[PDB]
Design a protein around this nucleic acid. Structure first.
Ligand SMILES: [Mg+2]
Ligand SMILES: [Mg+2]
Ligand SMILES: [Mg+2]
Ligand SMILES: [Mg+2]
Ligand SMILES: [Mg+2]
Ligand SMILES: [Mg+2]
Ligand SMILES: [Mg+2]
Ligand SMILES: [Mg+2]
Ligand SMILES: [Mg+2]
Ligand SMILES: [Mg+2]
Ligand SMILES: [Mg+2]
Ligand SMILES: [Mg+2]
Ligand SMILES: [Mg+2]
Ligand SMILES: [Mg+2]
Ligand SMILES: [Mg+2]
Ligand SMILES: [Mg+2]
Ligand SMILES: [Mg+2]
Ligand SMILES: [Mg+2]
Ligand SMILES: [Mg+2]
Ligand SMILES: [Mg+2]
Ligand SMILES: [Mg+2]
Ligand SMILES: [Mg+2]
Ligand SMILES: [Mg+2]
Ligand SMILES: [Mg+2]
Ligand SMILES: [Mg+2]
Ligand SMILES: [Mg+2]
Ligand SMILES: [Mg+2]
Ligand SMILES: [Mg+2]
Ligand SMILES: [Mg+2]
Ligand SMILES: [Mg+2]
Ligand SMILES: [Mg+2]
Ligand SMILES: [Mg+2]
Ligand SMILES: [Mg+2]
Ligand SMILES: [Mg+2]
Ligand SMILES: [Mg+2]
Ligand SMILES: [Mg+2]
Ligand SMILES: [Mg+2]
Ligand SMILES: [Mg+2]
Ligand SMILES: [Mg+2]
Ligand SMILES: [Mg+2]
Lengths: 47, 57, 93, 66, 110
RNA sequence: GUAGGGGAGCGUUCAGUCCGCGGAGAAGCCAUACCGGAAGGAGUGGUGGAGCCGACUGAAGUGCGGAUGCCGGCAUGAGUAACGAUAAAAGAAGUGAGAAUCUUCUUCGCCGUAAGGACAAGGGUUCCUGGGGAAGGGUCGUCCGCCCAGGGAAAGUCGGGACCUAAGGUGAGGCCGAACGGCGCAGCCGAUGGACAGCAGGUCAAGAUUCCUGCACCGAUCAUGUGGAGUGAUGGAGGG
RNA sequence: CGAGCUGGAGAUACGCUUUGACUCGGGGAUGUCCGAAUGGGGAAACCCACCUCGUAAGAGGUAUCCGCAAGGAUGGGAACUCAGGGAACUGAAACAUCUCAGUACCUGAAGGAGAAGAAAGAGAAUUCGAUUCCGUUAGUAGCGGCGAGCGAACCCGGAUCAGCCCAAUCAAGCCGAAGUGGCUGGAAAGCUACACCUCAGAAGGUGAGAGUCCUGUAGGCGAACGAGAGGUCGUUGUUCGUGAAACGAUGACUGAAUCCGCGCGGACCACCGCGCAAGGCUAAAUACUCCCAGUGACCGAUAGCGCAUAGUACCGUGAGGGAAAGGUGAAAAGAACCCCGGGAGGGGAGUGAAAGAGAACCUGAAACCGUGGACUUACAAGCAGUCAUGGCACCUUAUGCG
């Protein structure tokens, strides 16, 4: 049957993207929080 | 439903069970010609002899 | 400058056969405009070009031990000149 | 050479020395990519020279406007 | 945790100096410094000497082939010698010229 | 003698001090019929290859069989179930260290509005060539969508952009709100739509309305001629 | 500094360096694209422009807010600071005031600190004199469904001291004492015989444990650059829960005196005392610890950070979650060459002190899987032990208590 994850480049970028995350204080707060954890993958646009 | 064993089977048991897995070694005969060995009523796999000479080399 | 733009020549059965019909093939800087490439080849070889085509080429992703990585993305440029003009340093080849 | 040889000449001579160095580096890239490139070192050496040139003409152009 | 760390990456002798082997199997044998590596604290002296094996590689030559070459040693089994004493000797830094630093013993100098 | 109270001790790390061992071999590990009232403790021998015992004193992350406890390794079930559509296989030949499984030939069988062909989304080198065979393949593999190397993708005309607007998202000014912020006209972003110039063939081992051949087309800039007075926007109308 | 160097990387080749390399210290030049991003757009790291110079190559500029200008701002920063907003579980052995708690969290602004500060004060001696912080007062005085529970301040002793103006030496580095012989051992530091320096016996490295072998320590030297008002309603703050409720604090309404005047002293009045609101800045003691150095009756591979490094692999659309990982040898001398095998693996040889260290390399317990040997078992009812005896076997705490 049709499963949850149904890949869509533009979806992913527009939703979990760097521009997206920067558009809001809470997403900015993710960015900083992640940087802090030392993630290789700051954000989806890093893939 | 769904049977399952009640108790681990001892190493002793398990091995008593296995008292019958002895392979049976071939009864082996020596070819009357080229001389290695063969199975009764089969072609001698060294030369190819079964009285004259059937399989190839 | 000019010379910076032309990274290397393309070496492969294909490319040789191409130059044998007077058509040459260069590994270029990924950002290069086709006009930039055209001009660059002209200056570097004093050759008039009548036709170019290019192509960005994703670098092969390979692995060394546990380390997975990508090679540099490149760009291939194919040029064809007029007058059966040839380029010596790469014609004998 | 790094110090002497550079400063003594004109900023219009630099452009030329640069250009020629660029060109040799490219020749060495074609060679290397085709093989063998008997003398690798020369590459790096030429690189250095380029640097020197651009450093000098920078330095000088700002020391003549001191 | 490199070998030079303990000895401040510093060699207590130069390349080309003669050296007496203080410690080990080659006690006292003597030789010219053919190679000295500061950071690793390893030094070559025409006396240690081993038999190494070149295994498969068809260069040099298809077959194997064995070889006699010296194997470097740890700085701390090396010393400058003193032409008089002829033996294992410490070093003092004194002066000459004309801005040259030099090396003496209890009776300069090498 | 259970909960519980009391008493004397055993062993463990670390710490101070004393004694003192140790390459003619420490700790740890292994065997053992000896010792002590018990925790426990020595003797000898085997292992090991660089640290450590005894005594007194001090401080604890200090003693395990349980907690459907936690991490880890290995057993049982057991050579058991299963090997993933009942569309189906046979021989020859080749290769190879090894073949029911790979390659070729001849047939056989199964799909045929599909189980054939072409796009999109997605994937990302999986394509082609040459090699490889540990693991991945539910067997086997000499094979592969696996592993290694090198090649391969070409656009004025196809799709997107340098044009357009829809929902929607934005949005100087402007309207509200403890803060971060919520709205918001024009403008702007936004294809799933409007607009818009190239067809027929050929061929790499791997590209093709891109490359090559054959003949068209489009805008733009300039030159020569036809010029011989109009050009027509950021607003109007038609139209789309 | 003075001989090596060519990064972890250990690998071949090219080569650089006493005309001073490499490394260390100190300044500059260059510094693509994204990110406050800031020319415009954008699904970050990509697409599209305009202007001035320029021969082109190229260079520079093109955001918003304060300002005339100059110049300033935007963003980031683990904790620490202040401010706007502000939980519940829970405790009250139920719960609603209360408590958790002005804690968590959210937002803001800022610094290396910050806050606070120069008495319309605390207070009761007609005493003290800016603030913060520590001790103490003190679980006192008080608060409280007067239940649970909450909880000051003054004094005294310390840390650090400060009050002014306006409106009519450390950061590279260099110098730096003193031992040899024999013995064990593969190897000397250990043993042994005599010997020396110590302002230096802190420490690490050297084939095992080295004051006197190397690096160092005590001590000395050391740079061009480098661094030092009142009121009423509604509420609330401190011990302050409407209590007799003073005082500050504002949201609403309202609104006086200026020196014989004004504000306080816990309703309220007189008296007696302390005080000059409505105007601003202020270092020092204090907090924290991303980073750096020293130390440890802290840990040494399930411990210690999640990591002997990784926020990786891996899981998740995302927010987010998140591992295991260590050890040849003193030194690679990393096993030429021979044997079986396609290989894998192994047996030799050779190296090594040891391959009883061979790269699935320190020790290598237990579970668990096997080979071999002793005594044993195919008429047997069993928590598998325990006692007694007989048989066989064996003799290193062992010919007996076995
Ligand atoms: Mg293209
Ligand atoms: Mg691959
Ligand atoms: Mg009793
Ligand atoms: Mg002790
Ligand atoms: Mg211990
Ligand atoms: Mg257990
Ligand atoms: Mg269960
Ligand atoms: Mg388990
Ligand atoms: Mg069976
Ligand atoms: Mg069964
Ligand atoms: Mg069955
Ligand atoms: Mg079956
Ligand atoms: Mg199947
Ligand atoms: Mg079947
Ligand atoms: Mg054959
Ligand atoms: Mg089949
Ligand atoms: Mg055939
Ligand atoms: Mg199909
Ligand atoms: Mg692609
Ligand atoms: Mg298989
Ligand atoms: Mg083959
Ligand atoms: Mg393929
Ligand atoms: Mg065409
Ligand atoms: Mg909006
Ligand atoms: Mg469309
Ligand atoms: Mg069209
Ligand atoms: Mg189009
Ligand atoms: Mg040096
Ligand atoms: Mg921008
Ligand atoms: Mg509740
Ligand atoms: Mg309760
Ligand atoms: Mg900030
Ligand atoms: Mg009130
Ligand atoms: Mg209150
Ligand atoms: Mg009041
Ligand atoms: Mg361990
Ligand atoms: Mg082998
Ligand atoms: Mg047996
Ligand atoms: Mg009977
Ligand atoms: Mg019987």
């Amino acid at each position: 049957m049709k499963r949850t994850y149904q890949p869509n480049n533009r979806k992913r970028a527009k939703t979990h993207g760097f521009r997206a995350r920067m558009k809001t204080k809470s997403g900015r707060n993710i960015l900083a929080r992640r940087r802090a954890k030392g993630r290789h993958q700051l954000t989806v646009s890093d893939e | 439903k769904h049977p399952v064993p009640k108790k681990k089977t001892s190493k002793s048991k398990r091995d008593m069970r296995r008292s019958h897995h002895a392979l049976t070694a071939p009864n082996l005969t020596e070819c009357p010609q080229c001389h290695g060995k063969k199975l009764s009523h089969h072609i001698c796999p060294n030369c190819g002899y079964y009285d004259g000479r059937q399989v190839l080399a | 400058s000019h010379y910076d733009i032309l990274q290397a020549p393309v070496i492969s059965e294909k490319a040789y056969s191409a130059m044998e019909r007077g058509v040459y093939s260069f590994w270029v800087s990924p950002k290069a405009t086709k006009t930039e490439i055209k001009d660059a080849i002209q200056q570097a070889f004093g050759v008039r070009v009548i036709g170019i085509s290019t192509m960005n080429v994703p670098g092969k992703r390979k692995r060394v031990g546990r380390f997975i990585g990508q090679r540099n993305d490149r760009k291939k440029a194919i040029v064809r000149l007029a007058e059966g003009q040839s380029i010596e340093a790469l014609a004998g080849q | 050479m790094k110090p002497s040889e550079m400063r003594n000449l004109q900023a219009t001579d630099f452009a030329k020395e640069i250009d020629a160095r660029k060109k040799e580096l490219m020749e060495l890239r074609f060679q290397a990519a085709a093989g063998q490139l008997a003398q690798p070192h020369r590459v790096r050496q030429l690189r250095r020279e380029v640097a020197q040139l651009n450093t000098v003409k920078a330095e000088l152009a700002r020391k003549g406007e001191q | 945790p490199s070998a030079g760390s303990h000895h401040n990456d510093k060699l207590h002798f130069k390349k080309g100096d003669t050296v007496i082997v203080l410690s080990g199997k080659h006690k006292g044998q003597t030789g010219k410094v053919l190679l000295a590596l500061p950071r690793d604290q390893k030094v070559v002296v025409e006396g240690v000497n081993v038999i190494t094996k070149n295994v498969k590689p068809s260069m040099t030559n298809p077959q194997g082939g064995q070889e006699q070459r010296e194997l470097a040693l740890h700085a701390s089994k090396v010393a400058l010698v003193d032409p008089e004493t002829g033996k294992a000797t410490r070093v003092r830094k004194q002066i000459v010229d004309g801005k040259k630093v030099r090396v003496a013993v209890a009776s300069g100098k090498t």
